[PDB]
Scaffold this motif. Structure first.
Motif, PDB file in Angstrom:
ATOM      1  N   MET A 175      -8.934  10.133   5.200  1.00  0.00           N
ATOM      2  CA  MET A 175      -7.757  10.497   5.967  1.00  0.00           C
ATOM      3  C   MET A 175      -6.556  10.746   5.067  1.00  0.00           C
ATOM      4  O   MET A 175      -5.899  11.780   5.157  1.00  0.00           O
ATOM      5  CB  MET A 175      -7.423   9.396   6.970  1.00  0.00           C
ATOM      6  CG  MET A 175      -8.537   9.098   7.956  1.00  0.00           C
ATOM      7  SD  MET A 175      -8.193   7.615   8.926  1.00  0.00           S
ATOM      8  CE  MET A 175      -7.747   8.331  10.498  1.00  0.00           C
ATOM      9  N   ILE A 176      -6.277   9.795   4.191  1.00  0.00           N
ATOM     10  CA  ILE A 176      -5.143   9.897   3.289  1.00  0.00           C
ATOM     11  C   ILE A 176      -5.299  11.022   2.261  1.00  0.00           C
ATOM     12  O   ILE A 176      -4.312  11.603   1.821  1.00  0.00           O
ATOM     13  CB  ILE A 176      -4.893   8.515   2.615  1.00  0.00           C
ATOM     14  CG1 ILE A 176      -4.367   7.540   3.681  1.00  0.00           C
ATOM     15  CG2 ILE A 176      -3.926   8.642   1.455  1.00  0.00           C
ATOM     16  CD1 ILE A 176      -4.076   6.158   3.193  1.00  0.00           C
ATOM     17  N   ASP A 177      -6.535  11.346   1.899  1.00  0.00           N
ATOM     18  CA  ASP A 177      -6.793  12.425   0.945  1.00  0.00           C
ATOM     19  C   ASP A 177      -6.418  13.758   1.591  1.00  0.00           C
ATOM     20  O   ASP A 177      -5.737  14.595   0.999  1.00  0.00           O
ATOM     21  CB  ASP A 177      -8.278  12.451   0.573  1.00  0.00           C
ATOM     22  CG  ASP A 177      -8.610  13.516  -0.468  1.00  0.00           C
ATOM     23  OD1 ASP A 177      -9.812  13.845  -0.601  1.00  0.00           O
ATOM     24  OD2 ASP A 177      -7.683  14.010  -1.161  1.00  0.00           O
ATOM     25  N   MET A 191       2.982   9.576  -4.411  1.00  0.00           N
ATOM     26  CA  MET A 191       3.008   8.169  -4.027  1.00  0.00           C
ATOM     27  C   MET A 191       1.745   7.754  -3.273  1.00  0.00           C
ATOM     28  O   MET A 191       1.170   6.694  -3.542  1.00  0.00           O
ATOM     29  CB  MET A 191       4.244   7.872  -3.176  1.00  0.00           C
ATOM     30  CG  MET A 191       5.539   7.800  -3.979  1.00  0.00           C
ATOM     31  SD  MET A 191       7.051   7.809  -2.975  1.00  0.00           S
ATOM     32  CE  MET A 191       7.062   6.194  -2.345  1.00  0.00           C
ATOM     33  N   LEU A 192       1.306   8.586  -2.335  1.00  0.00           N
ATOM     34  CA  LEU A 192       0.109   8.279  -1.566  1.00  0.00           C
ATOM     35  C   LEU A 192      -1.136   8.211  -2.436  1.00  0.00           C
ATOM     36  O   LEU A 192      -1.888   7.236  -2.381  1.00  0.00           O
ATOM     37  CB  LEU A 192      -0.123   9.333  -0.499  1.00  0.00           C
ATOM     38  CG  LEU A 192       0.817   9.372   0.682  1.00  0.00           C
ATOM     39  CD1 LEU A 192       0.385  10.528   1.557  1.00  0.00           C
ATOM     40  CD2 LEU A 192       0.764   8.064   1.458  1.00  0.00           C
ATOM     41  N   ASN A 243       0.535  -1.131   2.647  1.00  0.00           N
ATOM     42  CA  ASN A 243       1.747  -1.065   3.433  1.00  0.00           C
ATOM     43  C   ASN A 243       2.596   0.026   2.850  1.00  0.00           C
ATOM     44  O   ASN A 243       3.327   0.703   3.561  1.00  0.00           O
ATOM     45  CB  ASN A 243       2.501  -2.382   3.392  1.00  0.00           C
ATOM     46  CG  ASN A 243       1.909  -3.405   4.322  1.00  0.00           C
ATOM     47  OD1 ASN A 243       1.738  -3.143   5.522  1.00  0.00           O
ATOM     48  ND2 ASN A 243       1.586  -4.578   3.786  1.00  0.00           N
ATOM     49  N   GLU A 244       2.509   0.197   1.541  1.00  0.00           N
ATOM     50  CA  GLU A 244       3.279   1.239   0.899  1.00  0.00           C
ATOM     51  C   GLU A 244       2.779   2.550   1.473  1.00  0.00           C
ATOM     52  O   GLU A 244       3.557   3.442   1.783  1.00  0.00           O
ATOM     53  CB  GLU A 244       3.069   1.223  -0.611  1.00  0.00           C
ATOM     54  CG  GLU A 244       3.622   2.456  -1.298  1.00  0.00           C
ATOM     55  CD  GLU A 244       5.130   2.583  -1.154  1.00  0.00           C
ATOM     56  OE1 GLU A 244       5.663   2.211  -0.081  1.00  0.00           O
ATOM     57  OE2 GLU A 244       5.781   3.067  -2.115  1.00  0.00           O
ATOM     58  N   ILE A 245       1.469   2.650   1.629  1.00  0.00           N
ATOM     59  CA  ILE A 245       0.865   3.853   2.170  1.00  0.00           C
ATOM     60  C   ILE A 245       1.327   4.110   3.596  1.00  0.00           C
ATOM     61  O   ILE A 245       1.561   5.250   3.992  1.00  0.00           O
ATOM     62  CB  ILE A 245      -0.654   3.745   2.145  1.00  0.00           C
ATOM     63  CG1 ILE A 245      -1.154   4.019   0.726  1.00  0.00           C
ATOM     64  CG2 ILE A 245      -1.252   4.686   3.159  1.00  0.00           C
ATOM     65  CD1 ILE A 245      -2.644   4.218   0.608  1.00  0.00           C
TER      66      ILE A 245
END
Lengths: 253, 24
Positions: A175-177, A191-192, A243-245
């Motif tokens: 998902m994040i990719d 950052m991600l 959490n940063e994500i």
């Protein structure tokens, strides 16, 4: 829109028309002259109405189909904004047909165009916001489970716990990719990707930290305090990252 | 789905066509 558009997809849909509205602004209203005749807009303006009609059609089904509550409250006003904006465009074509040099009609063109793009923008951000909430859901789920590593005192469980957190990680990573490839801000993508990389490499470390604990936790010897402090540190570290994500996913201009 | 995003793209292209007639 002045600020860069939130994602590559939105940018792709709006940016070009936003440029045109700028050209039309510079041209007619707020620009050099404007009254030199304006051909019949009845044809194209009818096409916008249809399109708008379909967009509201699709959006409404979306409303009575989604589970997200925010989407359910936030999308409906966009239909109106868009529908009302369309009304101005139709009134404008009409006026123009009666008078090609009508300025209030030209004002209506710009106004009606803006309302449609703005309302279409709200619709896409609302939809986008609902999508990021799905990713977060996954992230908080991984957060919730990470808080379980605290128990686990057997190789059996450690293997189970592993059998569960593994696909979670894999799912959050995809998902994040993909979400990252869509961002229109360099720093945010960066950052991600870093947070996700830091997390991908901490997994093998959490598992080792855990294997270490269960072992010493099953050996009448060994300094358990140490293993504990470190396993916990690893979880504290994986969490902060996640959490940063989550934080970064909600960043918007 | 992507149906929502596609219909949003049409409204945009249909409006664009409108401004294109204004030679904008």
């Amino acid at each position: 829109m002045m600020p860069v558009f939130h994602t590559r997809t939105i940018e792709s849909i709006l940016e070009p028309v936003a440029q045109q509205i700028s050209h039309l602004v510079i041209m007619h209203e707020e620009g050099e002259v404007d009254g030199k005749a304006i051909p019949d807009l009845t044809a194209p303006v009818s096409a916008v109405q249809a399109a708008v009609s379909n967009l509201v059609r699709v959006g409404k089904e979306t409303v009575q189909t989604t589970e997200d509550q925010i989407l359910k409250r936030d999308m409906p006003p966009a239909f109106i904004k868009v529908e009302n904006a369309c009304t101005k465009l139709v009134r404008a074509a009409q006026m123009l047909q009666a008078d090609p040099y009508s300025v209030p009609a030209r004002d209506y063109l710009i106004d009606g165009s803006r309302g449609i793009l703005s309302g279409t923008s709200d619709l896409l951000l609302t939809f986008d916001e609902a999508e990021v909430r799905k990713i977060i859901r996954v992230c908080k789920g991984i957060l919730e489970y990470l808080t379980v590593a605290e128990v686990v005192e057997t190789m059996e469980d450690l293997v189970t716990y592993t059998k569960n957190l593994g696909p979670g990680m894999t799912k959050m990573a995809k998902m994040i990719d993909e979400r990252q490839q869509e961002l229109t801000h360099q720093e945010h993508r960066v950052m991600l990707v870093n947070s996700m990389n830091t997390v991908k490499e901490l997994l093998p470390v959490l598992i080792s930290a855990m294997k270490i604990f269960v072992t010493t936790k099953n050996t009448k010897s060994q300094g358990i305090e140490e293993a504990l402090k470190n396993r916990n540190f690893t979880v504290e570290k994986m969490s902060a990252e996640i959490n940063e994500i989550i934080r970064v996913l909600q960043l918007t201009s | 789905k992507k149906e929502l995003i596609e219909s949003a793209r049409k409204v945009s292209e249909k409006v664009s066509h409108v401004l294109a007639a204004l030679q904008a």
